[PDB]
Design a protein around this ligand. Structure first.
Ligand SMILES: [Fe+3]
Ligand SMILES: [Fe+3]
Ligand SMILES: [Fe+3]
Ligand SMILES: [Fe+3]
Ligand SMILES: [O-]
Ligand SMILES: [O-]
Lengths: 166, 388, 510, 388, 510
């Protein structure tokens, strides 16, 4: 009852099995990603199982989405009903408008949490990953070592618990 | 020196004695089969499976993975090294795929090397034998040079369409097959140029430059829709599976097969050209080889997935329709080339029979697999409407 | 009618013209650089000639393996310690070869010039060959060796231990996650040029010294393909040298790449060589200085100077932290021996003398520790003692760097002892150096890898082993062992009785 | 057991130390080149030459031999194991010959093996690709099955003509070349049957039995004189050089080339047959390979022998005249096959032009090398008399 | 439309039909027998498949040789005595392989059934491969061994010595001169089935025992082809069994062939094995009895009883003459050491004990002889002594059998001491046994081979050696040596100083 098979995982498989509405399933996924993924997760309580749980959710959302959407939409429409290309183009605009790396990072992370397939079509999603990632790196890698660690720690907003250097 | 300065533990008396002294009396485990934990596709586990399955370090969160935890380093933004998010298709285990030909690197290069060496011998025999003497000059200086040459850009484009897949494939068995499918495509492209280069050497005024065939491809009319379909399958598809499926189970299976088998392989022999068919034999041998792998992945494994069969079929029927249209257009534009042939080369009756061979073969080997209801008469009719 | 044909170069002459222009003809991967679409490649090859040159090598290799080498029982007459070391060396290198396939696929997609794409493509195929070759080594030692356990299932057993996490950072994720150019630097400019190329040859050296003629046969064949990959890396820089973004980003991605690769190999390779062998070839401190400082840092990097490339700013730091690095890590690897998929041995008398001779002060620190552990019965199942207990008893916490995944013990280390602990949004993080700390601070979402203490927290050791199949055919004896002798092998029960339960060491700061 | 019971001197500590202690400090001779005394044909001595030249234990009384004295055991009556008496040709050294392709056994079977495995791949691709659908039924069932099939007996006869030479050849280099010339002929005969067997698998009703082709060969008219010539070359010639020379530099160079290249290779394509040409490609590659060896032995070495050039040319001209007549008769009877073709397949002008290509190639590659005064139009006119 | 092809068996099914009838379709060679028109063959091969199965073997063989074995310095780490023995073993077998090509070409001509012709054909091709394989062994040892002389020019330097003459009888002329069936018996039914097939394997054992892993690699590969040849021999008997001529002639040609083969191999093989090695594998006396008496003269031969084949009537004499045969011959080979193309050594102390232990009485005869020769300085260049002189001083003439060419010294030999001297039409002839005497009396014109004494009569020793290129590259040091040490090598001047002049021993008779 640990690594690959455990009570918390069995619990979630039964939980997703209660889903039978693309809207419901799609909403739970988006919420799951908000609570348990990225350094901005609402908590680290599912740290050892969220990666696996997420995938199992995606499966339910994908199956429902294929049966609910028509060919045209499954290719150009998000699980929520948004127009993929619209979101993609919109997010990129904001990213290119980001004033700094701190702003850019927030845009990218958020995008992933909200539209990662089965929400947004893979073609549009990875296309965004391509444009968004480029801008994030451009801002982050400029004069990468200028800011001393003491200061960088403050910018990140981390709580320093211990430092030791002989 | 004769003995050398380096002492080897297998042959050096002192060192070997030390090694032998430390050896156990018998193996510390009787299970001497690497990959014993892999589920055999056939009667007994094969070398192909042992050496390949599970080489990819996927964690359990990617269907089939045996590892655990997140990746150690991800992309700026958070994207995983490999992830479920890179393809619409879903499965119970990405490691299920099996190349029917069980090709790992060694057998793969062994076979292609043999083909390279025999090809060289063939060319040396063909030229020494003076067989070029009975080849129709117009078919050579016009159809092989310009139109067959132009087709190399098609195969080349299909080759490049595999780049992302080489990076995103979610398993070793699928990554190896994809790589080989793509490498064979560039081989064909290079074989087209090889022939043009050969002709250049044995035909005084033959120019091997790709200038002519390239212009035809980039600006011509015969391959216009063909090029458009390629530019899309390659640079507009970000899903590694849609790319592989659409290219091999849609476009190349219809357009590609028609051009290679029903046009050049069929007409070249009529102009005293056994040279071009020597290379098409390779392209077709490769096409039929890859086909078995393509079928095993998208049908046996995905389309028939114990849990996502329905879903996957829907996605592929979707893709089948999405690209069937550009493929049809490609076939229509190509039809124009028939008007350039010398009077009496072929008749609408023959071309119609050749189109149905492609369509029927396609429906039999691909369309019916995912229950894609395709009408042979409408397809042939739509394409056929591109002649004079 | 003279016999005529056409060769690879004659076709390659027109390869660059193979690519054509069109709106969406561009890389699908995020990147700060622009590879020039006029970039050329060094080797004028086509698919068929490539296959032939490799097929010929395969011929020799498999011929020697299947015939003479097998007739000589080469798979058996190898020192026990080395048989074990190759389980790690071949399988860990295997994943590097494997991810390199995907990496060059990504570089193939990045390049816009047909020749540069073709250059990367050749590597895609080469790395496929190397994957199968490393797999063959394990496959062969499993079939004909003195201990097939681990050689036969490393692909799943490697998962149990902490050393594997760091290997994935430099040989898996470092190769494919990030700016294509960054990955190229980790893989080719640094990975292959600075480490793998020299390493692969060095391995055949240590192998031969220890009776292993199997590895030299395969690894020497792999080596013949590396010149193409070196060139690929060199051309990567040449391809982006003219782009303005280069002067602004290249030296930082390179530095991050250099630190990333050395952070793991400095400790790990020296450990595998010196502690995983009986007969020694050369002191790791000497080897390291030659590879990193001389050959790479000097000659190799020097040639890229005209392209704006500079010696990694962290080079001085790397050299300072290196001296005791491998020695410090073996203590941890052995203390955690039940988590491996290979058998380990403590240094014998001749070796301790060799270590002290080449590393003054070695005995007084590491030597005395090993003798203490041995006298206490760390090699005997009935002792109820696993060295990890000694670390807990003497309050020597073992941490995992959040970035490199490299295990480190600040309170005991003779090498670096810095430690930085931070908390961010309900999660604690432990760093072992200032370069890795910067990486995390600036790119938090790139490094969320759970460490073994986090995953195994509250779990009893034998359960983890059992669940992840860390057992031999008999279903009771452990694959891993604290000695390399044929008798008194530890069993799952011997471990269960220890009642060792994992704890997340970072929680002590709460 | 683990280590086994047999101790090996290379690895056994005790035995190896014994071996090592007896070794010299360095090699007892620095000349580490086997065959160093062999006069190289090219820049440096080749592995082909080293492993082959002087393997035959000829004494000096057989031109070029390095041994001395009579054989140890001769035939009842006194005939020597090998002797000058087995051939009319004379030379300063029977070891001068060199296969321009430098084929010793390893390279020879390597190449044929590549051809075998690729042939198998090709057939599997051809069958799977359904390319048989477009092959003309009449050409398939009549011309391939009966007439191409009957030709296997011609190649089989030529193969057998080599038996005595395999036994009588006066040097290693000549024996090896001759053996390979013969082995390639049996291979071709077997590839003709291979194709018939293949068609029997992919074409319902096609009978692979050799009964029909054999009856054509033994009792038909088209191959009557061809068979008569083969029976003669094989069993009526007791001179191993007259056999190899007349087979390769007269009969097969004229009749053989015409049948293979100007009939089947030339017409098969016109009936949508890319199958037969696949195999004829091998036959022509083999023909051109053998030609280089045949030319080196008979022209470079014997016809240009510093001491017997004039004598050898006189004999070869004699043999050319002796065998040219039967060869013309063979071609003459073969002309009868053109009347069996579907109307419009080919015409007298095409036939004549193709005859001249073979005759002109023969005059250039063979006749001219020994000053044989061949009259191309007289030869062609004699053959054309066979057209019905 | 399923993937389909055609295999060898499927084509072979129709091969018997390939041959057709015509008046002159008959063998071109003299023969007392008629091979049955319907004879079949065991292996259903066609050219393409034959090539593939041999190509696979070559890959393994050459891969081992070029890669691992070369890396292990296998060409060098062999006992000096064995490096010399392989000069003779590999080159002498080479001629057997070579003449076997011509022999099977002759049998291919003899056979009328297409399948039987085809079976012989495969052997023609196999014997070409074996010729090149034995060539490669000498080629490899010359290129990478401790003493290339002899290995590098045996094809011309073997003509200097008497042992070569006998080799040509059993492995050259015996294979191709006579009734095709008689030749088949010498080659296949006796030669390969009784001696070569067993010999080849035995050689790999003695080789491995003396550090030679090169020969095992090649010879074990040669061995994989012998099954086909054994079958050719068996089918030869079958093909002629139902012909009246068989009952009249078969057993006579078989008995003659057996004596022919045995006469040379009985003494020579045992000599190369026991005297040409350091480490022994098995006493020749037991090896011989098992090979000749049990395996062949019992099992194999008995299986052919149903076809009229009987155990050779001369088998008994062969056994009686066998025991001391090889010992008697080494005395002669060593005494005539200057005529060889290899270095020889006197039995060492440890060896003399082995000989005495395995051959009671060996010491009182041969042991004392060698001890005296060493005392006379047979190993030292300044002694001015060669064992031949000892034979002259003690009136022990050395004769050469007119038929088998095997040298013999009836006045000294512990084995057969028979000698028959006849004068005929102005020529003297010397025979050593009653079987060879009958052969000459009945077939005088088949045996006119001049012996070394007849050819060298009145010639000074150093002149013969010089003329036939018996020197090392320095053009002064002899290839042949009376010891295998690396120093004090005899030169042409050392021999010339002996002023040894050959004379024909038979001329003493009036
Ligand atoms: Fe690699
Ligand atoms: Fe590499
Ligand atoms: Fe043989
Ligand atoms: Fe044989
Ligand atoms: O590599
Ligand atoms: O043989």
């Amino acid at each position: 009852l640990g690594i690959h098979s455990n009570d918390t995982r069995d619990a979630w498989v039964n939980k997703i099995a209660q889903l039978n509405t693309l809207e419901k399933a799609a909403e739970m996924l988006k919420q799951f990603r908000m609570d348990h993924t990225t350094p901005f997760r609402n908590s680290y309580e599912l740290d050892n199982d969220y990666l696996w749980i997420e995938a199992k959710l995606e499966e339910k959302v994908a199956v429902l989405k294929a049966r609910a959407f028509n060919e045209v939409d499954f290719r150009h429409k998000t699980a929520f009903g948004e127009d993929a290309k619209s979101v993609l183009d919109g997010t990129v605009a904001k990213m290119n408008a980001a004033k700094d790396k701190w702003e850019a990072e927030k845009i990218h992370i958020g995008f992933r949490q909200a539209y990662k397939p089965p929400i947004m079509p893979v073609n549009y999603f990875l296309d965004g990953e391509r444009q968004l990632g480029t801008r994030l790196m451009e801002l982050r890698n400029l004069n990468y070592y200028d800011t001393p660690l003491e200061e960088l720690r403050k910018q990140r907003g981390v709580r320093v618990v211990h430092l030791q250097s002989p | 020196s004769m003995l050398g300065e380096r002492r080897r533990g297998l042959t050096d008396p002192e060192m070997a004695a030390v090694i032998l002294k430390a050896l156990p009396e018998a193996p510390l485990d009787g299970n001497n089969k690497m990959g014993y934990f892999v589920t055999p596709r056939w009667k007994r586990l094969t070398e192909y499976e042992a050496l390949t399955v599970y080489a990819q370090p996927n964690a359990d969160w990617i269907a089939g993975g045996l590892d655990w935890g997140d990746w150690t380093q991800k992309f700026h933004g958070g994207r995983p090294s490999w992830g479920n998010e890179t393809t619409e298709l879903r499965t119970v285990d990405w490691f299920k795929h099996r190349d029917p030909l069980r090709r790992w690197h060694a057998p793969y290069v062994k076979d292609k090397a043999e083909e390279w060496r025999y090809t060289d011998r063939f060319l040396q025999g063909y030229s020494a034998d003076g067989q070029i003497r009975a080849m129709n000059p117009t078919w050579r200086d016009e159809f092989i040079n310009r139109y067959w040459g132009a087709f190399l850009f098609n195969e080349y484009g299909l080759f490049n369409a595999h780049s992302q897949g080489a990076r995103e494939a979610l398993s070793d068995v699928t990554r190896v097959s994809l790589a080989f499918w793509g490498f064979d495509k560039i081989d064909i492209a290079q074989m087209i140029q090889l022939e043009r280069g050969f002709l250049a050497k044995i035909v005084p005024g033959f120019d091997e430059s790709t200038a002519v065939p390239k212009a035809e491809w980039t600006n011509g009319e015969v391959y216009k829709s063909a090029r458009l379909a390629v530019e899309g399958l390659w640079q507009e598809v970000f899903d590694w599976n849609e790319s592989a499926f659409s290219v091999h189970a849609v476009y190349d299976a219809l357009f590609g097969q028609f051009v290679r088998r029903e046009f050049f392989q069929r007409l070249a022999p009529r102009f005293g050209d056994n040279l071009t068919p020597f290379f098409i034999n390779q392209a077709q041998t490769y096409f039929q080889i890859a086909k078995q792998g393509v079928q095993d992945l998208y049908y046996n494994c995905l389309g028939d997935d114990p849990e996502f069969s329905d879903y996957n079929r829907t996605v592929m029927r979707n893709w089948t329709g999405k690209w069937l249209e550009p493929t049809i257009a490609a076939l229509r534009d190509f039809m124009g080339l028939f008007a350039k042939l010398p009077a009496g080369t072929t008749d609408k009756e023959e071309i119609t029979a050749s189109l149905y061979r492609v369509v029927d073969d396609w429906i039999e080997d691909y369309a019916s697999r995912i229950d894609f209801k395709a009408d042979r008469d409408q397809i042939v009719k739509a394409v056929l409407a591109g002649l004079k | 009618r003279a016999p005529t044909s056409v060769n690879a170069q004659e076709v390659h002459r027109w390869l660059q013209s193979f690519n054509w222009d069109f709106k969406n003809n561009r890389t699908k991967y995020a990147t700060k650089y622009k590879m020039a679409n006029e970039t050329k490649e060094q080797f004028k090859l086509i698919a068929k000639e490539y296959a032939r040159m490799e097929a010929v090598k395969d011929e020799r290799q498999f011929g020697s393996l299947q015939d003479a080498l097998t007739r000589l029982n080469a798979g058996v007459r190898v020192h026990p310690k080395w048989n074990e070391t190759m389980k790690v060396v071949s399988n860990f290198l295997e994943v590097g070869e494997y991810n390199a396939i995907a990496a060059t696929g990504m570089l193939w997609d990045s390049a816009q010039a047909a020749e540069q794409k073709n250059g990367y493509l050749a590597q895609v195929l080469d790395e496929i060959r190397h994957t199968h070759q490393c797999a063959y080594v394990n496959y062969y030692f499993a079939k004909n060796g003195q201990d097939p356990a681990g050689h036969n299932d490393a692909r799943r057993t490697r998962t149990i231990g902490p050393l594997w996490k760091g290997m994935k950072r430099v040989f898996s994720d470092g190769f494919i996650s990030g700016d294509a150019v960054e990955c190229s630097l980790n893989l080719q400019l640094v990975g292959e040029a600075c480490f793998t190329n020299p390493l692969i040859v060095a391995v055949t050296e240590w192998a031969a010294a220890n009776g292993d003629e199997i590895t030299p046969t395969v690894f020497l064949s792999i080596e013949t393909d590396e010149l193409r990959h070196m060139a690929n890396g060199y051309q990567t820089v040449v391809s982006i040298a003219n782009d303005p973004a280069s002067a602004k980003y290249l030296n930082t991605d390179l530095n991050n790449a250099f630190w990333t690769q050395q952070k793991y190999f400095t400790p790990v390779l020296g450990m595998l060589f010196e502690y995983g062998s009986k007969f020694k070839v050369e002191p790791w401190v000497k080897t390291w200085d030659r590879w990193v400082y001389e050959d790479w840092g000097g000659i190799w990097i020097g040639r890229l100077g005209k392209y704006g490339v500079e010696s990694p700013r962290s080079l001085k730091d790397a050299k300072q932290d290196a001296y005791w690095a491998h020695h410090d890590l073996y203590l941890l690897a052995y203390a955690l021996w039940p988590t491996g998929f290979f058998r380990l041995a403590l240094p014998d008398q001749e070796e301790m003398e060799w270590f002290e001779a080449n590393y003054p002060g070695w005995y007084d620190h590491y030597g005395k520790i090993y003798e203490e552990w041995r006298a206490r019965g760390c090699e005997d199942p009935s002792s109820g003692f696993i060295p990890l207990m000694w670390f807990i008893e003497n309050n020597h916490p073992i941490y995992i760097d959040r970035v490199s995944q490299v295990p480190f013990c600040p309170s005991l280390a003779k090498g670096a002892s810095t430690l930085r602990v931070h908390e961010y949004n309900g999660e604690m993080h432990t760093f072992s150096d200032q370069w890795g700390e910067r990486m995390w601070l600036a790119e938090p979402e790139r490094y969320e890898c759970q460490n073994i203490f986090e995953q195994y927290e509250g779990r009893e050791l034998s359960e983890v082993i059992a669940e992840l199949h860390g057992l031999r055919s008999d279903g009771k004896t452990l694959i891993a062992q604290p000695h390399v002798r044929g008798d008194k092998l530890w069993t799952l029960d011997d471990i269960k009785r220890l009642n060792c339960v994992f704890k997340n060491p970072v929680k002590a700061f709460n």
